[PDB]
């Protein structure tokens, strides 16, 4: 079944990462020392994106790329598609494993839909966004600093903060953290005993939770909703952009030195970033 | 202990010698500081 197919491939997905951070460089693709072999520390190392000359090539080892040469398969940066594909299939195997485990237990597979969030986030950020981009070069790297650089690049080139979907994702993440903390505190402070906690919350906040069912339901559906909205925002980024663009305020601030907005300063920062590399 | 007394200790020095000279650089294609332009 699906119980012993996710383990091997994911291992390779893991394996190529470590050798992808200690021996294989990016001097011929990104012109950077993205390997420990040059002395880059744990935060600095990563698995760099493939060179843009190959476009959307899958970079198969046996295929026309690298002609089966493993050293060529390293220098062409095929490790990034290698790791991305292996990790995505490991994730789908984990999804299927959760589904079949829920079926075996017989309970309704709410854990599968809970984990559907990270599945969507990964398949959108690391697979779909490069598909909608020019090539794998603009795809995020597999590392620590590469992710931060990708985040800053998206901020510069898309105004990702102003996108309502990342706003909903931020709200979902923060609400999930809030509900987790409040749930821990309530559970370890009532030591069921729900009614007295309800009374306490009524006298503190004004309203409380009628049932533990509603509280657990909401803490289940807040962060997954945030993740799904972030994935939908990535979908929109690949397609025509949809952000709360205030062209009227930009026009007003363009010629009026006495009118300025935090939105106008954010726009100035965004084009300032976009300006000074090509 | 017998089956593990030999497998583990040798590989450490094996890797030390593998990376101490011009084997890893040519194996994985990562340029040496000389090849860097």
């Amino acid at each position: 079944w699906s119980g012993l197919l996710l383990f091997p491939c994911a291992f390779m997905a893991l394996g190529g990462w470590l050798t992808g951070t200690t021996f294989v460089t990016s001097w011929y693709t990104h012109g950077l020392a993205s390997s420990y072999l040059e002395g880059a520390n744990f935060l600095t190392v990563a698995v760099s994106s493939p060179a843009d000359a190959f476009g959307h090539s899958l970079l198969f080892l046996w295929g026309p790329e690298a002609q089966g040469n493993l050293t060529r398969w390293f220098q062409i940066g095929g490790l990034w598609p290698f790791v991305a594909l292996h990790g995505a299939f490991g994730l789908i195997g984990f999804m299927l494993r959760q589904f079949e485990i829920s079926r075996l237990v017989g309970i309704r597979p709410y854990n599968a839909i809970a984990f559907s969030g990270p599945i969507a986030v990964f398949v959108s950020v690391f697979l779909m966004y490069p598909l909608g981009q020019s090539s794998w070069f603009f795809a995020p790297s597999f590392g620590v600093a590469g992710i931060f650089r990708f985040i800053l690049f998206l901020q510069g080139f898309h105004n990702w903060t102003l996108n309502p979907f990342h706003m909903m994702g931020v709200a979902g993440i923060l609400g999930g953290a809030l509900l987790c903390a409040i749930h821990g505190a309530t559970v370890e402070n009532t030591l069921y005993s729900m009614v007295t906690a309800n009374r306490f919350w009524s006298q503190i906040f004004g309203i409380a939770f009628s049932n533990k069912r509603w509280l657990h339901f909401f803490m289940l559906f807040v962060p997954v909703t945030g993740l799904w909205m972030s994935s939908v925002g990535i979908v929109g980024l690949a397609l025509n952009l949809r952000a709360y663009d205030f062209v009227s305020q930009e026009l007003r601030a363009a010629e009026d030195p006495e009118f300025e907005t935090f939105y106008t300063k954010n726009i100035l920062l965004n084009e300032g970033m976009r300006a000074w590399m090509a | 202990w017998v089956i593990h007394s030999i497998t583990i200790p040798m590989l450490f020095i094996a890797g030390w010698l593998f990376v101490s000279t011009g084997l890893a650089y040519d194996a994985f294609g990562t340029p040496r500081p000389d090849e860097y332009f």
């Binding site: 383990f7 291992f11 394996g15 470590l18 050798t19 200690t22 420990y36 072999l37 040059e38 002395g39 | 583990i8 590989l11 450490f12 020095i13 094996a14 890797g15 030390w16 593998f18 990376v19 101490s20 890893a24």
Partner: peptide, 28 residues
């Protein structure tokens, strides 16, 4: 079955840590 399920990652690990330890002097 746990024998391979441990060794398949045990062997590369011990192969790599020796190189990583030697690494701090090769660049010197």
């Amino acid at each position: 079955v746990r024998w391979l399920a441990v060794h398949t990652l045990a062997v590369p690990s011990v192969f790599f840590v020796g190189a990583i330890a030697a690494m701090q002097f090769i660049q010197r």
